[PDB]
Amino acid sequence: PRVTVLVREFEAFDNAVPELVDSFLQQDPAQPVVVAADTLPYPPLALPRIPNVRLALLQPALDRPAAASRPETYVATEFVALVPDGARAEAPGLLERMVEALRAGSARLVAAPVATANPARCLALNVSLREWTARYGAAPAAPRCDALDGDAVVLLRARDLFNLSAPLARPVGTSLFLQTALRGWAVQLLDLTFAAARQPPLATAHARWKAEREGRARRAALLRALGIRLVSWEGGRLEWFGCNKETTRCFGTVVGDTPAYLYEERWTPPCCLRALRETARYVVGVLEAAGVRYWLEGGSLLGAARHGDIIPWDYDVDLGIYLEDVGNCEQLRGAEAGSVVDERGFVWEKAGDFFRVQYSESNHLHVDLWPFYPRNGVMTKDTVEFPEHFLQPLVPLPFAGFVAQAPNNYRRFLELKFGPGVIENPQYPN
Amino acid sequence: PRVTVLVREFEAFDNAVPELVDSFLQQDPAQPVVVAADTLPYPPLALPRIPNVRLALLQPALDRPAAASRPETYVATEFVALVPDGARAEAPGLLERMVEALRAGSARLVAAPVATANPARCLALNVSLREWTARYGAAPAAPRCDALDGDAVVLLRARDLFNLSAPLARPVGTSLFLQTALRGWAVQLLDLTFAAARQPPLATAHARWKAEREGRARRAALLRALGIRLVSWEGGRLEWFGCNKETTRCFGTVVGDTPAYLYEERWTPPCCLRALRETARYVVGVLEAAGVRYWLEGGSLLGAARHGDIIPWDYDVDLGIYLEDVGNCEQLRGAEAGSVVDERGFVWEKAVEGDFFRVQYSESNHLHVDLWPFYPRNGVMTKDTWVEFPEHFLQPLVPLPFAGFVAQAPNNYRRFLELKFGPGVIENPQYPNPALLSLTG
Amino acid sequence: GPRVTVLVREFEAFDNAVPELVDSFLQQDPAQPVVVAADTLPYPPLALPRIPNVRLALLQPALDRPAAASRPETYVATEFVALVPDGARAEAPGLLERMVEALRAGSARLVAAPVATANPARCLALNVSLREWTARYGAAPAAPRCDALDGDAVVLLRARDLFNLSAPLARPVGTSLFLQTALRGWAVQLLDLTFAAARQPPLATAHARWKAEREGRARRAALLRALGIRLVSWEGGRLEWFGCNKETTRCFGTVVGDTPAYLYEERWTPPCCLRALRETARYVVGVLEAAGVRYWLEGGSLLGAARHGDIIPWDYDVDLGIYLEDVGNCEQLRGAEAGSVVDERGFVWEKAVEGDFFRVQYSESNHLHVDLWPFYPRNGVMTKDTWLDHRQDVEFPEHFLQPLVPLPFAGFVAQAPNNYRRFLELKFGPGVIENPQYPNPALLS
Amino acid sequence: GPRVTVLVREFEAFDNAVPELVDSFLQQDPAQPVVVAADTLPYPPLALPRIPNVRLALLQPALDRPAAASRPETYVATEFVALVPDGARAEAPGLLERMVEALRAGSARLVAAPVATANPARCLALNVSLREWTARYGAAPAAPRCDALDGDAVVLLRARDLFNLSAPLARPVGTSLFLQTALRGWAVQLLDLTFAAARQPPLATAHARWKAEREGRARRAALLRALGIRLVSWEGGRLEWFGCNKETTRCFGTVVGDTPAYLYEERWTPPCCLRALRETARYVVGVLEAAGVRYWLEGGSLLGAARHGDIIPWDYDVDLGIYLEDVGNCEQLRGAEAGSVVDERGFVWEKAVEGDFFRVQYSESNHLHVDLWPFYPRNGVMTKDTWDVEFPEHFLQPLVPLPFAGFVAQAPNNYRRFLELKFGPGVIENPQYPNPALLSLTG
Numbered sequence A: 001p002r003v004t005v006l007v008r009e010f011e012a013f014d015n016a017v018p019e020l021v022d023s024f025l026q027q028d029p030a031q032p033v034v035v036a037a038d039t040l041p042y043p044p045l046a047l048p049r050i051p052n053v054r055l056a057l058l059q060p061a062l063d064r065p066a067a068a069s070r071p072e073t074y075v076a077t078e079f080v081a082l083v084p085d086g087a088r089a090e091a092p093g094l095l096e097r098m099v100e101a102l103r104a105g106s107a108r109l110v111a112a113p114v115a116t117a118n119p120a121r122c123l124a125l126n127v128s129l130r131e132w133t134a135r136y137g138a139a140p141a142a143p144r145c146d147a148l149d150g151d152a153v154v155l156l157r158a159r160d161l162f163n164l165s166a167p168l169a170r171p172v173g174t175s176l177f178l179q180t181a182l183r184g185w186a187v188q189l190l191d192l193t194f195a196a197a198r199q200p201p202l203a204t205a206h207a208r209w210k211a212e213r214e215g216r217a218r219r220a221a222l223l224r225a226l227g228i229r230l231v232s233w234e235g236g237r238l239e240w241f242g243c244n245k246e247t248t249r250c251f252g253t254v255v256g257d258t259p260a261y262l263y264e265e266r267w268t269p270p271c272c273l274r275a276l277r278e279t280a281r282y283v284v285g286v287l288e289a290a291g292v293r294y295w296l297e298g299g300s301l302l303g304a305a306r307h308g309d310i311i312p313w314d315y316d317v318d319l320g321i322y323l324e325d326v327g328n329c330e331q332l333r334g335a336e337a338g339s340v341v342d343e344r345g346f347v348w349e350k351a352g353d354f355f356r357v358q359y360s361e362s363n364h365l366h367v368d369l370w371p372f373y374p375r376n377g378v379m380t381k382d383t384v385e386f387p388e389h390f391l392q393p394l395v396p397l398p399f400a401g402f403v404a405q406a407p408n409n410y411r412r413f414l415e416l417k418f419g420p421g422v423i424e425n426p427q428y429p430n
Numbered sequence B: 001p002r003v004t005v006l007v008r009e010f011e012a013f014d015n016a017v018p019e020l021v022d023s024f025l026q027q028d029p030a031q032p033v034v035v036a037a038d039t040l041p042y043p044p045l046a047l048p049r050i051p052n053v054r055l056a057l058l059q060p061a062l063d064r065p066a067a068a069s070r071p072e073t074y075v076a077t078e079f080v081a082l083v084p085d086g087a088r089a090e091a092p093g094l095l096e097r098m099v100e101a102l103r104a105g106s107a108r109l110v111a112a113p114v115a116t117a118n119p120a121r122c123l124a125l126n127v128s129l130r131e132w133t134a135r136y137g138a139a140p141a142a143p144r145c146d147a148l149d150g151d152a153v154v155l156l157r158a159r160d161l162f163n164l165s166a167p168l169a170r171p172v173g174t175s176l177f178l179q180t181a182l183r184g185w186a187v188q189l190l191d192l193t194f195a196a197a198r199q200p201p202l203a204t205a206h207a208r209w210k211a212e213r214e215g216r217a218r219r220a221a222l223l224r225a226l227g228i229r230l231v232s233w234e235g236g237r238l239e240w241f242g243c244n245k246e247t248t249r250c251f252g253t254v255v256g257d258t259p260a261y262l263y264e265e266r267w268t269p270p271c272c273l274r275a276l277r278e279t280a281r282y283v284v285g286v287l288e289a290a291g292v293r294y295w296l297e298g299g300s301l302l303g304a305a306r307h308g309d310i311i312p313w314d315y316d317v318d319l320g321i322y323l324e325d326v327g328n329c330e331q332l333r334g335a336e337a338g339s340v341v342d343e344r345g346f347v348w349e350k351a352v353e354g355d356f357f358r359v360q361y362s363e364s365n366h367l368h369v370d371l372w373p374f375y376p377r378n379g380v381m382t383k384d385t386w387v388e389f390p391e392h393f394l395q396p397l398v399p400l401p402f403a404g405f406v407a408q409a410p411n412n413y414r415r416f417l418e419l420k421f422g423p424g425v426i427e428n429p430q431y432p433n434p435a436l437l438s439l440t441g
Numbered sequence C: 001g002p003r004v005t006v007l008v009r010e011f012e013a014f015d016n017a018v019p020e021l022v023d024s025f026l027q028q029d030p031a032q033p034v035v036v037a038a039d040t041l042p043y044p045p046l047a048l049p050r051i052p053n054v055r056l057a058l059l060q061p062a063l064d065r066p067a068a069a070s071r072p073e074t075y076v077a078t079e080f081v082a083l084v085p086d087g088a089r090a091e092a093p094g095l096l097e098r099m100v101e102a103l104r105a106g107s108a109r110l111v112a113a114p115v116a117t118a119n120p121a122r123c124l125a126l127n128v129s130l131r132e133w134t135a136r137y138g139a140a141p142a143a144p145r146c147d148a149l150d151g152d153a154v155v156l157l158r159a160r161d162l163f164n165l166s167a168p169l170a171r172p173v174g175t176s177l178f179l180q181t182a183l184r185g186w187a188v189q190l191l192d193l194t195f196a197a198a199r200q201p202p203l204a205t206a207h208a209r210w211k212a213e214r215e216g217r218a219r220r221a222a223l224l225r226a227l228g229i230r231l232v233s234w235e236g237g238r239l240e241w242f243g244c245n246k247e248t249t250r251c252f253g254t255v256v257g258d259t260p261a262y263l264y265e266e267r268w269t270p271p272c273c274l275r276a277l278r279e280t281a282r283y284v285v286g287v288l289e290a291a292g293v294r295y296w297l298e299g300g301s302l303l304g305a306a307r308h309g310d311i312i313p314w315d316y317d318v319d320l321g322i323y324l325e326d327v328g329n330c331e332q333l334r335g336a337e338a339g340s341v342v343d344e345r346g347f348v349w350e351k352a353v354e355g356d357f358f359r360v361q362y363s364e365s366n367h368l369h370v371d372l373w374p375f376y377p378r379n380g381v382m383t384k385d386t387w388l389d390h391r392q393d394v395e396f397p398e399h400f401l402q403p404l405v406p407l408p409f410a411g412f413v414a415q416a417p418n419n420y421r422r423f424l425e426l427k428f429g430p431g432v433i434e435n436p437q438y439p440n441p442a443l444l445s
Numbered sequence D: 001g002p003r004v005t006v007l008v009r010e011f012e013a014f015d016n017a018v019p020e021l022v023d024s025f026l027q028q029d030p031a032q033p034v035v036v037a038a039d040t041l042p043y044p045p046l047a048l049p050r051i052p053n054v055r056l057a058l059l060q061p062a063l064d065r066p067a068a069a070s071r072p073e074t075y076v077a078t079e080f081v082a083l084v085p086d087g088a089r090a091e092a093p094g095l096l097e098r099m100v101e102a103l104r105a106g107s108a109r110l111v112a113a114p115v116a117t118a119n120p121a122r123c124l125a126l127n128v129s130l131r132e133w134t135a136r137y138g139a140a141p142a143a144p145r146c147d148a149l150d151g152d153a154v155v156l157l158r159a160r161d162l163f164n165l166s167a168p169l170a171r172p173v174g175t176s177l178f179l180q181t182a183l184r185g186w187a188v189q190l191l192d193l194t195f196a197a198a199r200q201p202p203l204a205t206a207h208a209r210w211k212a213e214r215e216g217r218a219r220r221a222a223l224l225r226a227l228g229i230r231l232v233s234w235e236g237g238r239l240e241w242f243g244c245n246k247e248t249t250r251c252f253g254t255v256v257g258d259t260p261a262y263l264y265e266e267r268w269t270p271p272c273c274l275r276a277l278r279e280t281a282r283y284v285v286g287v288l289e290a291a292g293v294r295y296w297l298e299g300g301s302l303l304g305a306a307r308h309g310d311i312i313p314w315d316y317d318v319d320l321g322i323y324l325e326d327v328g329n330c331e332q333l334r335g336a337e338a339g340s341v342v343d344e345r346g347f348v349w350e351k352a353v354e355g356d357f358f359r360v361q362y363s364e365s366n367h368l369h370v371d372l373w374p375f376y377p378r379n380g381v382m383t384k385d386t387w388d389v390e391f392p393e394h395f396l397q398p399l400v401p402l403p404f405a406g407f408v409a410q411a412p413n414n415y416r417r418f419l420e421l422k423f424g425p426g427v428i429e430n431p432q433y434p435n436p437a438l439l440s441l442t443g
């Protein structure tokens, strides 16, 4: 029952890794221990320079072979225990007990909380790569859970850990369970408890603040690298890791009416959908303030009728307007002379049948406004047409968080425009 | 089929990779081809959907196994030919001709220029990790060289390529030869030319500007990641990638009197030495203008006597001054009352601790010159906090080259240094010792 | 499930196939843990792959290394370890795992697989007797279950068992390992799996082979001496000696307090020294008989003869009584009164300094000896003028010498007093024949 | 409960006072832990008290013992160990306790107390250089704080420090202990406490001392060779050598791949090998000057002369150039064209296998060598018809004196230029010592 201790989560400027390592060596002087890091920690860790204790440096180097940064190559045992900074081994044979639990149970990971101020708690977790989203909540079947929040020793087989795509990406507590929950693995939070370091790290408030800030930065870089734009929690809290008003949109220019996320087998990033909703809400309120007649058009009306929202692989919003009302709103008249950035940062342009409103100068998610005019009972443009009774009157229809205006009898309208059954038969990307 | 074509250097927004792939497949339908990218290239490359053409995405991903991001997974032949975008296969048999050249010569790498506007040139390259420097120059034994500049097809054994730490780090033209030259491997530039693509990529000024901006950013990040702080051409045309007046110094706060770079088995970053030279020259200029008697002290004097420069693993500069001259210098007078940022960004501080003065390069970069005031008492220079020495060593001072200018040193400075440090200190440098440092701490 | 560290110990630095060995295992598993152990850093360089799972363990002390750096168990983190000799190659995949599975399913603590060299391992029986400094090998009665192996094999066992031995990696490992496991009652199961031989085997030339065999023979002799094996025997009767001879010193050095050093080590007289004592006793008796000197077995030599016709197994010399008036008959004895004499066979004869007796030494260098005690009849009672402070040194009635009787001793027939039971009880006490004890029980019993 | 274990390692089986030593400590505290350590069972018998707190530790492999039996830490259950030499005696009660109090309150890893023998311990400075294979001793400038002790002292340190060393009990302990602790930068503090001497001191006769010293110097020589200490010096002098010489092979033997064995050891050239190289160079230069052969320092020899007046400390030969037209002046050189020549002082002169140069080896057995490269002017350029880059003749018109290896050699004029032509700009100022990591990568 040989288990390698692997230490990955610590701060070079303030850690208790020498105590952690010394505590395991007091129980077994030949205990295999691997401390992993991206660069050589400074100030020096000053680990014991004995063969069973090794520092694994994970970044590339001009003077090292490929194997030197592959952590599986430092681990020879069947099992591996991930130990966070702040833990120490006090009683003996605790790794042995965790191994027995793993072999007895049905969960590929077992875990023991560390008696810190934040000992690990069970969590439910779903990961939807298609929607770039990870959803956390309370774990119904605890102590069997999908993920942990807080400090714990996690033990699993080395062949399971190191066949993951990113086994030691930081923060481990986020990165590991995103990968294992996606594979359908469970973690059993055992009743065993590891003691805290007798001299804990981050004792001052300044040190904790510094560490929390570095940790938030690592978590944000991790989620961006792995395609998680949104972390949501049971109870409503949202964590965003995508585009915003001062960045570019996530996918950039489209070619052939197929954005890049479709070729990645994903749908629209949720931050982009959020920016579209708020631009739809903004434009609609501007149009209504100026007394401009508008209705939902094209795919936006289709999504409104289907689920009251933007079709989740769509990437813009379409509204129709009465051409004779264009003069009623200041931004449109401005848009005819040139680009107009208004007081809220939105960008209105004509560019030349329609108008386009972009979320911001940098973020080019947009709403298109298509002007129609009644020529003789049918609405028509000049660069397909439809009867004007569909606009007399217009009906309320929930869309993108607010109440939009839609053609009356819009299901009939939508089957006119797209064919029979379009609401019930979405054209899923493949 | 013994060679796998591997395409790493191209841009998603403007490339000729489809023509490249097609050109090799027209010569052999079964030719193994791997296009490597960090993420899925957009717009779609639309490569042929055949078993011998694979798109390798090297970034880690939540739904992929470890092997998916390891490039050797995608290659099953003895050799790899790195092919830059813009090249095209025209004459058949070029790859197998390059294999024959490799087997018969002594170079680990063989290369063929691509007939673009920037065809590959043979280069010398010396890589010193201790001094964080990559020194390029003209190749004395061309067409045997250490590195190439420009477009070439590069063939080598897959075993050799994928044993490197960063075999496909971009730019390949830079990271490959940094790694192979450090190992002492040669590349042989053959008398063979690959043709250029018939529709070349990046054919507009705007497209090339975009590509060059992105390539420069990738190179700067690569050199920092690998610890190359200085790149030179024939000892000149310096390109810096380290610290400067507006940043922190490279190694930050020193703990235990041993800076971080010694644990990394290296010497002082050359950007830090450059800043130390500039600060010493500036301080000496100020002290002489104000009429302040100074001399090189400690390891600065030792370095000056040894080779006229800072000892290349030291990280500061020490000068002695006459205490009664302190009042002559505005900055030193100001430093007694508090920290002073002068006209040119240098920070002058009075040590309340050890009773010396410290001049820092900038507010953010704490590379420093230390100033040690002494005062005579019965012919012996002494101070009140802590070795004292006879005053006659200062009567007179003598000129001594140091750090690119002429400094002042005690007369008989070899005797001076020997009394301070021991006999033979000038001839017997205390070279850094990683093994010992690993043992003592 | 099973993790096995490959550990290489048996190779020559001047000529070996370790690179091929290690590379063959890396071809089956790139992260395969491999430990090469050596006493000093091999030159020319081994040039192993400088990868974290391949390590060089140096078993030498060094000024800049902790104690752990030369203890090989700190390099092995796995449950199991496989000792692999140079000249072997990993060819079939998963052989180590099949070995782990056989060990777990069997009852032996060691399992082994031959290597397809010109000398593949073979099953042997082995008895070790430290008290008699002897190792006895024979044919395996219950093959493929053995006590020892002869020849090349991969040997797999638990790290905790290997590294709890006193000298786990002493060379030659093929000798050293099974001396330690057989003494503990452990068995090695010879499995029906075969590792392939190296494609470019080491020691390809006759000259390189010949230098390797002599270096190995020197290491084996050093190992056996270090561990106190003086004699190795094989079924068929063949003997290898590793102690005394006519041309060296005797094994133990000067004896204080009647108790030689080996008895405090809980061992008996080395077999090297006993053989020489028998050769010297046989020779001296022949000289005295040919010279017409009446002699009889004395002291511990007579007691050993009465018990089992041989030297007592913990004694270190031989004693004979002679008639003083016969001394002049023997050329060596006449010479010995004038000084030290080295005779026709290299035996050394001297008249001692202590107490009016003669001593015959096996050689000039080897001081195993026969002591000759001259007696003369006073009035029917044998006597001498100077006495040693032993309870065994007394007068005795001449009728015990009239006549002498034959009695086997040390491989030949010797002359003994008649009624030698009563003779022995008179000088040692009642029941001496039936109650063996060490030369002086107040110190060691 | 006691917190120090007395440990005895330095004694001779044939003549010791270890029974008196043990008894004296047990008299102060009958429970005092005592370990006597030896490589084999001491004979004649020590006959130590048969009590649980007195133990004999035999540090020898044995067929019937567990690995732990030969590991000294196995025998020590206390925080501290006191190494006590034979000839010492415990009289004043509570001396070990004062030593523990001294160690805890000071900043030295080791504390020591002299034993009042005829050779009481003295405080010494010691610098250990593994790269130069040298131990330099001297007077201790900051006594009572030392790097090392000479003479008889009880030494106390933590068990975890002592048994963490590679060779904690290697003999003689007085040498091996402080080589290990001084290398680590640990201090020993010589306390103002004295242990008494044994009432019946061991080794009381001249003959007994003679035997003890003979085996002790044998142990020291084997210890220093095993640990890679080739040279011991006192105050820079009184050299004591433990390497190669005129009668032996050179330390690193045959060089494969132009990389001598000492580089893989992460060390530089052994000092005995450098000493023989200086002697051979001085001799060869003396011969060539007497015979009228023009020569000059060449290659790395010139580089070492220009940099610090000596052989570069990780180089292992010496290179000189000569005028080919002058070779006939020297008898040894003339003989070398016919075959190998062992001259009157044992040096071996040979004309190269292939490569047209001459080689002078230190002796028939020791192959440290000086190479001579003959050049000849072909219109103002020096050239050898075999290939040491060709160079212009004016660098030798005239030659200049240059200190090298303890004597004055001839160098090309403007040797700074000369070296930069052959090695590249700034070569004198940019020495780069061996890089073992780079050696481990490239081979």
Ligand SMILES: *[C@@H]1O[C@H](CO)[C@@H](O)[C@H](O)[C@H]1NC(C)=O
Residues within 6 Å of the ligand: A047, A048, A049, A050, B439, C064, C065, C066, D160, D161, D164
């Ligand atoms: C043992 O020595 C090594 C130095 O080689 C050091 O790293 C380690 O911490 C030491 N251990 C103890 C317990 O002193």
Ligand SMILES: *[C@@H]1O[C@H](CO)[C@@H](O)[C@H](O)[C@H]1NC(C)=O
Residues within 6 Å of the ligand: A124, A125, A126, A135, A136, A137, A138, A234
């Ligand atoms: C995860 O998926 C299940 C459906 O399989 C769902 O009911 C559950 O609520 C999801 N978990 C979270 C935390 O949203």
Ligand SMILES: *[C@@H]1O[C@H](CO)[C@@H](O)[C@H](O)[C@H]1NC(C)=O
Residues within 6 Å of the ligand: A072, A158, A159, A160, A162, A163, B066
């Ligand atoms: C992945 O799993 C397989 C099968 O368990 C194993 O052979 C391989 O070593 C694993 N990869 C690792 C540990 O990197």
Ligand SMILES: *[C@@H]1O[C@H](CO)[C@@H](O)[C@H](O)[C@H]1NC(C)=O
Residues within 6 Å of the ligand: A063, A064, A065, B159, B160, B163, C048, C049, C050, C051, D440, D441, D442
């Ligand atoms: C990989 O590179 C290392 C040098 O760091 C070398 O030791 C090893 O042999 C190389 N492996 C192969 C297969 O070339």
Ligand SMILES: *[C@@H]1O[C@H](CO)[C@@H](O)[C@H](O)[C@H]1NC(C)=O
Residues within 6 Å of the ligand: C125, C126, C127, C136, C137, C138, C139, C235
């Ligand atoms: C080993 O001892 C056993 C036990 O008496 C005996 O049966 C066997 O004959 C001996 N074998 C050898 C080879 O001496």
Ligand SMILES: *[C@@H]1O[C@H](CO)[C@@H](O)[C@H](O)[C@H]1NC(C)=O
Residues within 6 Å of the ligand: C073, C159, C160, C161, C162, C163, C164, D067
């Ligand atoms: C000796 O065996 C024990 C168990 O019996 C084990 O814990 C220990 O690691 C072993 N020691 C060595 C040095 O292998």
Ligand SMILES: *[C@@H]1O[C@H](CO)[C@@H](O)[C@H](O)[C@H]1NC(C)=O
Residues within 6 Å of the ligand: B421, B422, D125, D126, D127, D136, D137, D138, D139, D235, D236
């Ligand atoms: C030891 O080294 C120091 C510093 O290098 C030096 O001052 C001292 O003289 C040296 N001592 C001896 C005995 O060599």
Ligand SMILES: [Mg+2]
Residues within 6 Å of the ligand: A015, A199, A200, A201
């Ligand atoms: Mg702390």
Ligand SMILES: [Mg+2]
Residues within 6 Å of the ligand: A316, A368
């Ligand atoms: Mg659109």
Ligand SMILES: [Mg+2]
Residues within 6 Å of the ligand: B316, B370
């Ligand atoms: Mg300083």
Ligand SMILES: [Mg+2]
Residues within 6 Å of the ligand: C299, C300, C301, C315, C317, C318, C319
């Ligand atoms: Mg007898």
Ligand SMILES: [Mg+2]
Residues within 6 Å of the ligand: C317, C318, C319, C371
């Ligand atoms: Mg006797």
Ligand SMILES: [Mg+2]
Residues within 6 Å of the ligand: D317, D371
């Ligand atoms: Mg040479």
Ligand SMILES: [Zn+2]
Residues within 6 Å of the ligand: A242, A243, A244, A249, A250, A251, A269, A270, A271, A272, A273
């Ligand atoms: Zn977005």
Ligand SMILES: [Zn+2]
Residues within 6 Å of the ligand: B242, B243, B244, B249, B250, B251, B269, B270, B271, B272, B273
């Ligand atoms: Zn810098």
Ligand SMILES: [Zn+2]
Residues within 6 Å of the ligand: C243, C244, C245, C250, C251, C252, C270, C271, C272, C273, C274
């Ligand atoms: Zn014997």
